[PDB]
Design an enzyme around this catalytic site. Structure first.
Site, mmCIF file in Angstrom:
data_model
loop_
_atom_site.group_PDB
_atom_site.id
_atom_site.type_symbol
_atom_site.label_atom_id
_atom_site.label_comp_id
_atom_site.label_asym_id
_atom_site.label_seq_id
_atom_site.Cartn_x
_atom_site.Cartn_y
_atom_site.Cartn_z
ATOM 1 N N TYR A 227 56.389 -7.721 -7.750
ATOM 2 C CA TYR A 227 57.763 -7.256 -7.634
ATOM 3 C C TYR A 227 58.116 -6.787 -6.231
ATOM 4 O O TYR A 227 59.297 -6.529 -5.960
ATOM 5 C CB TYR A 227 58.030 -6.120 -8.633
ATOM 6 N N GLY A 228 57.134 -6.695 -5.332
ATOM 7 C CA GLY A 228 57.358 -6.284 -3.956
ATOM 8 C C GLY A 228 56.076 -5.968 -3.209
ATOM 9 O O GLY A 228 55.015 -5.799 -3.818
ATOM 10 N N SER A 229 56.160 -5.902 -1.880
ATOM 11 C CA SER A 229 55.057 -5.479 -1.029
ATOM 12 C C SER A 229 55.346 -4.083 -0.492
ATOM 13 O O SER A 229 56.509 -3.691 -0.354
ATOM 14 C CB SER A 229 54.856 -6.453 0.134
ATOM 15 O OG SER A 229 55.122 -7.791 -0.258
ATOM 16 N N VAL A 230 54.286 -3.332 -0.195
ATOM 17 C CA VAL A 230 54.408 -1.942 0.233
ATOM 18 C C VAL A 230 53.698 -1.730 1.567
ATOM 19 O O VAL A 230 52.599 -2.249 1.794
ATOM 20 C CB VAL A 230 53.850 -0.964 -0.823
ATOM 21 C CG1 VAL A 230 54.138 0.483 -0.416
ATOM 22 C CG2 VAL A 230 54.445 -1.252 -2.184
ATOM 23 N N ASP B 228 56.176 5.448 -11.086
ATOM 24 C CA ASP B 228 56.056 4.091 -11.637
ATOM 25 C C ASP B 228 56.565 4.003 -13.078
ATOM 26 O O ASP B 228 55.838 3.645 -14.010
ATOM 27 C CB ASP B 228 54.613 3.581 -11.549
ATOM 28 C CG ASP B 228 54.265 3.026 -10.178
ATOM 29 O OD1 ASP B 228 55.126 3.061 -9.271
ATOM 30 O OD2 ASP B 228 53.109 2.586 -9.999
ATOM 31 N N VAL C 180 49.776 -1.697 2.556
ATOM 32 C CA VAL C 180 48.854 -1.065 1.616
ATOM 33 C C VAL C 180 48.719 -1.820 0.303
ATOM 34 O O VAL C 180 47.732 -1.604 -0.425
ATOM 35 C CB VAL C 180 49.254 0.405 1.345
ATOM 36 C CG1 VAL C 180 49.076 1.250 2.599
ATOM 37 C CG2 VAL C 180 50.682 0.496 0.837
ATOM 38 N N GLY C 181 49.642 -2.708 -0.058
ATOM 39 C CA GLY C 181 49.542 -3.432 -1.315
ATOM 40 C C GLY C 181 50.688 -4.390 -1.591
ATOM 41 O O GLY C 181 51.677 -4.414 -0.860
HETATM 42 MG MG LIG Z 1 51.197 2.236 -11.177
#
Ligand SMILES: [Mg+2]
Ligand SMILES: N#Cc1ccc(CNC(=O)N2CCOCC2)cc1
Ligand SMILES: [Cl-]
Ligand SMILES: [Cl-]
Ligand SMILES: [Cl-]
Ligand SMILES: [Cl-]
Ligand SMILES: [Cl-]
Length: 345
Positions: A30-33, A163, A27-28
């Site tokens: 500092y890291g991948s999700v 977040d 989905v997207g």
């Molecule tokens: Mg955000």
């Protein structure tokens, strides 16, 4: 105790995860999700693989900071940690960290654009932000990045804060939502800031729910300051003394003085109780802003306020923030927190 892991490549990235997580779909910096289905709980979840979590001292401490914060947060209006795992079987091969949270749908931006909001909707949404903030602030945590894209909302109008601030100069430059909700003392480095910066952001968000439009959509730092001072007035001598940046003090005094505007003539037709609360949040001198605990008792929230159902946090030990350690020492502290995780009931 250790589950079985399986491997797959998702957009040039190898993911190794427990069998319980199925149907991984991307989905997207500092890291991948990836979204996934958790077969143990029946939830749709977000799985985040951290990028280079221990590449430097700064990065290793940030990884530890994020995991400590997410492990502590246990409140209805704040994002919590569902799981954390590593495929490593020992500290010596430990390199990757994965974080699992509830998958979130719409955010408050989608709400304000596509929904006609009643005064009851505004009351309930801002009440929930303040209920979560009372909890966060009671642990001496400052969020620092409250804005509509960091607030998840579901079909029942229920809200969660996500977040946490854990931002580059370029990210804050120009006509950008990443700066429109920031308190002036942090936007311009006037002074050492504290948790009152988050209340300024809540005022900006509440104004936008009432009118449908950004309160302070500045085209740069200076344009935005001019918009702020037009509404709330230029600083008095009392606040000028507290601006410890001598250069910032001198620039402010370059500006012609302006009085605070009439908020009933800005927020035309709004509930008079909403106007009163906005005047108590959008105060230039941060010492004089209303707090989250005080705001929950304001008459605007009379139909939702329950002082027996607005809990505070367990104490939160942040002494690590002033500690100086080597990369491998931060990495070992993080590994300890991964293997000790206890899932929610
Ligand atoms: Mg955000
Ligand atoms: N690494 C680490 C590390 C983990 C836990 C503690 C203290 N125990 C704790 O917070 N819990 C809450 C959840 O149930 C068990 C006890 C200290 C260090
Ligand atoms: Cl499993
Ligand atoms: Cl949650
Ligand atoms: Cl690993
Ligand atoms: Cl936003
Ligand atoms: Cl603690």
């Amino acid at each position: 105790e250790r589950p079985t892991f399986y491997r797959q490549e998702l957009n040039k990235t190898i993911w190794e995860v427990p069998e319980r997580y199925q149907n991984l779909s991307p989905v997207g910096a500092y890291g991948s999700v990836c979204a996934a289905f958790d077969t143990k709980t029946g939830h749709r979840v977000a799985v985040k693989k951290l990028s280079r979590p221990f590449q430097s001292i700064i990065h290793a401490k940030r990884t530890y900071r994020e995991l400590r914060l997410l492990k502590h947060m246990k409140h209805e209006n704040v994002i919590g940690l569902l799981d954390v795992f590593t495929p490593a079987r020992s500290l010596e091969e430990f390199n990757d960290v994965y974080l699992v949270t509830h998958l979130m749908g719409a955010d408050l931006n989608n709400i304000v654009k596509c929904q006609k909001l009643t005064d009851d909707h505004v009351q309930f949404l801002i009440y929930q932000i303040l209920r979560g903030l009372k909890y966060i602030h009671s642990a001496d945590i400052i969020h620092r990045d409250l804005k509509p894209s960091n607030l998840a909302v579901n079909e029942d109008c229920e809200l969660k804060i996500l977040d946490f601030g854990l931002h580059t100069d370029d990210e804050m430059t120009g006509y950008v939502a990443t700066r429109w909700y920031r308190a002036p003392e942090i936007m311009l480095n006037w002074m050492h800031y504290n948790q009152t910066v988050d209340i300024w952001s809540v005022g900006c968000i509440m104004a936008e729910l009432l009118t449908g439009r950004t309160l302070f959509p500045g085209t740069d730092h200076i344009d935005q300051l001019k918009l702020i001072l037009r509404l709330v007035g230029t600083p008095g001598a009392e606040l000028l003394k507290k601006i410890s940046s001598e250069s910032a003090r001198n620039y402010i005094q370059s500006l012609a003085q302006m009085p605070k505007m009439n908020f009933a003539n800005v927020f035309i037709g709004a509930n008079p109780l909403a106007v009163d609360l906005l005047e108590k949040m959008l105060v230039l001198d941060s010492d004089k802003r209303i707090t989250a605990a005080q705001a929950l008792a304001h008459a605007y929230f009379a139909q939702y306020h329950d002082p027996d159902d607005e809990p505070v946090a367990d104490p939160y030990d942040q002494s690590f923030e002033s500690r100086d350690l080597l990369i491998d020492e931060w990495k070992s502290l993080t590994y300890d927190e991964v293997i000790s995780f206890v899932p929610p009931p």
